[PDB]
Scaffold this active site. Sequence first.
Site, PDB file in Angstrom:
ATOM      1  N   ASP A 138       0.734  -1.145  -0.068  1.00 30.91           N
ATOM      2  CA  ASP A 138       0.057  -0.094   0.107  1.00 30.91           C
ATOM      3  C   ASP A 138       0.887   1.276  -0.275  1.00 30.91           C
ATOM      4  O   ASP A 138       0.536   2.369   0.582  1.00 30.91           O
ATOM      5  CB  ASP A 138      -0.932  -0.015   1.333  1.00 30.91           C
ATOM      6  N   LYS A 140       2.173   4.694  -1.174  1.00 37.40           N
ATOM      7  CA  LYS A 140       1.933   5.941  -1.808  1.00 37.40           C
ATOM      8  C   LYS A 140       2.231   7.035  -0.892  1.00 37.40           C
ATOM      9  O   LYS A 140       2.353   6.776   0.380  1.00 37.40           O
ATOM     10  CB  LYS A 140       0.250   5.758  -2.377  1.00 37.40           C
ATOM     11  N   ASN A 143       1.104   7.323   2.611  1.00 32.54           N
ATOM     12  CA  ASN A 143       1.465   6.181   3.703  1.00 32.54           C
ATOM     13  C   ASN A 143       2.879   6.709   3.900  1.00 32.54           C
ATOM     14  O   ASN A 143       3.603   5.505   4.478  1.00 32.54           O
ATOM     15  CB  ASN A 143       1.373   4.911   3.072  1.00 32.54           C
ATOM     16  N   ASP A 160       1.108   2.680   7.936  1.00 33.86           N
ATOM     17  CA  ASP A 160       0.061   2.161   7.385  1.00 33.86           C
ATOM     18  C   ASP A 160       0.239   0.567   6.748  1.00 33.86           C
ATOM     19  O   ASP A 160       0.292   0.220   5.897  1.00 33.86           O
ATOM     20  CB  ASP A 160      -0.654   2.592   6.510  1.00 33.86           C
ATOM     21  N   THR A 179      -4.706   0.906  -3.396  1.00 29.29           N
ATOM     22  CA  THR A 179      -5.291   2.178  -4.059  1.00 29.29           C
ATOM     23  C   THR A 179      -5.051   1.995  -5.714  1.00 29.29           C
ATOM     24  O   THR A 179      -3.772   2.274  -5.969  1.00 29.29           O
ATOM     25  CB  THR A 179      -4.593   3.637  -3.488  1.00 29.29           C
TER      26      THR A 179
HETATM   27  N1  LIG Z   1       2.247   6.711  13.194  1.00 27.45           N
HETATM   28  C1  LIG Z   1       1.675   7.750  12.792  1.00 27.45           C
HETATM   29  N2  LIG Z   1       2.135   9.037  13.004  1.00 27.45           N
HETATM   30  C2  LIG Z   1       1.174  10.036  12.568  1.00 27.45           C
HETATM   31  N3  LIG Z   1       0.176  10.023  11.582  1.00 27.45           N
HETATM   32  C3  LIG Z   1      -0.486   8.574  11.583  1.00 27.45           C
HETATM   33  C4  LIG Z   1       0.426   7.627  11.825  1.00 27.45           C
HETATM   34  N4  LIG Z   1      -0.296   6.411  11.411  1.00 27.45           N
HETATM   35  C5  LIG Z   1      -1.225   6.790  10.751  1.00 27.45           C
HETATM   36  N5  LIG Z   1      -1.270   8.077  10.682  1.00 27.45           N
HETATM   37  C6  LIG Z   1      -2.225   8.886  10.032  1.00 27.45           C
HETATM   38  O1  LIG Z   1      -3.492   8.186  10.048  1.00 27.45           O
HETATM   39  C7  LIG Z   1      -4.009   8.237   8.742  1.00 27.45           C
HETATM   40  C8  LIG Z   1      -4.550   6.767   8.469  1.00 27.45           C
HETATM   41  O2  LIG Z   1      -4.084   5.732   9.309  1.00 27.45           O
HETATM   42  P1  LIG Z   1      -3.796   4.256   8.571  1.00 27.45           P
HETATM   43  O3  LIG Z   1      -2.421   3.475   9.137  1.00 27.45           O
HETATM   44  O4  LIG Z   1      -3.335   4.437   7.041  1.00 27.45           O
HETATM   45  O5  LIG Z   1      -4.973   3.733   8.573  1.00 27.45           O
HETATM   46  P2  LIG Z   1      -5.855   2.611   7.553  1.00 27.45           P
HETATM   47  O6  LIG Z   1      -4.975   1.265   7.480  1.00 27.45           O
HETATM   48  O7  LIG Z   1      -6.359   3.304   6.542  1.00 27.45           O
HETATM   49  N6  LIG Z   1      -7.241   1.924   8.439  1.00 27.45           N
HETATM   50  P3  LIG Z   1      -8.476   1.510   7.915  1.00 27.45           P
HETATM   51  O8  LIG Z   1      -9.400   2.324   7.396  1.00 27.45           O
HETATM   52  O9  LIG Z   1      -9.250   0.797   9.280  1.00 27.45           O
HETATM   53  O10 LIG Z   1      -8.332   0.149   6.831  1.00 27.45           O
HETATM   54  C9  LIG Z   1      -2.480   8.125   7.842  1.00 27.45           C
HETATM   55  O11 LIG Z   1      -2.546   8.087   6.304  1.00 27.45           O
HETATM   56  C10 LIG Z   1      -1.827   9.204   8.533  1.00 27.45           C
HETATM   57  O12 LIG Z   1      -2.400  10.544   8.303  1.00 27.45           O
END
Ligand SMILES: Nc1ncnc2c1ncn2[C@@H]1O[C@H](COP(=O)(O)OP(=O)(O)NP(=O)(O)O)[C@@H](O)[C@H]1O
Length: 280
Positions: A138, A140, A143, A160, A179
């Site tokens: 994933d 991009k 992320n 992520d 994506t």
């Molecule tokens: N360690 C981190 N520190 C700061 N911001 C973070 C961090 N992890 C995630 N984020 C923010 O949170 C957003 C979403 O987190 P993410 O880990 O992508 O969840 P996800 O996998 O989309 N969850 P889901 O919708 O349940 O499948 C990111 O794209 C970042 O903007």
Amino acid sequence: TVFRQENVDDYYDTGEELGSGQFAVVKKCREKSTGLQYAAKFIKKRRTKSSRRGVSREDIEREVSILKEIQHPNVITLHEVYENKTDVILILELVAGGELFDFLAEKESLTEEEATEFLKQILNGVYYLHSLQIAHFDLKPENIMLLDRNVPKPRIKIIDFGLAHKIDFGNEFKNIFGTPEFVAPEIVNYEPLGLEADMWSIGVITYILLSGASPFLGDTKQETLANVSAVNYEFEDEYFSNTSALAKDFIRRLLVKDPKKRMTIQDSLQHPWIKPPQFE
Ligand SMILES: Nc1ncnc2c1ncn2[C@@H]1O[C@H](COP(=O)(O)OP(=O)(O)NP(=O)(O)O)[C@@H](O)[C@H]1O
């Protein structure tokens, strides 16, 4: 695998929301016992076996298992994991400089040097992951997070790992899909997937970093996916007229349909330029 079931609120205080996903929300937080800040990712659990809402236990445990194994400057680390009836809460390393996606949106387009500075860090992180046979699946701009964006050469960390998988048999066959704009042809065609898929995504990211434009983006998801499968992209002169031929060469060797002919992460590090869901 069970996680800590005490109320997270008894050990942490939350603040600003960092990101919001379909089944997860990430909030800045502070551990009461140390004053140290983290990013708390709340993943919604499935309330029944046959539910579209929420993430399966299997999928949550996979993300946690992978996160627990990694420790590298360019990848996010896991601090602790809590859970309750509705969510599994991952306490992750905080990256407060925002998404590379937002950084690029505010700056339009970078110089090759600025682009390579970002890319080299992404490559180092992916090199670490691939060395452990971990495919991210994933990759991009959204992320990739910066530690501090108010510096000329922002440091980054890959985040992520919700789609990440251990590739111990060379490939995985389970309809994994990220994506549209960044997925490789093999993902679009529902074929066996391996570390090669991440390398294609890196090619897309590189194209974007240098031009401010997406190589396969169509007006609809189906169009984008069709473009990806046909490797329907080109280096528009308006965007690349002042970009080096070597940079284009690097991209050209990543955006290859046959996964076996695509540059590997090791190849990308030795390349002359570097060497010093789906329905809608
Ligand atoms: N360690 C981190 N520190 C700061 N911001 C973070 C961090 N992890 C995630 N984020 C923010 O949170 C957003 C979403 O987190 P993410 O880990 O992508 O969840 P996800 O996998 O989309 N969850 P889901 O919708 O349940 O499948 C990111 O794209 C970042 O903007």
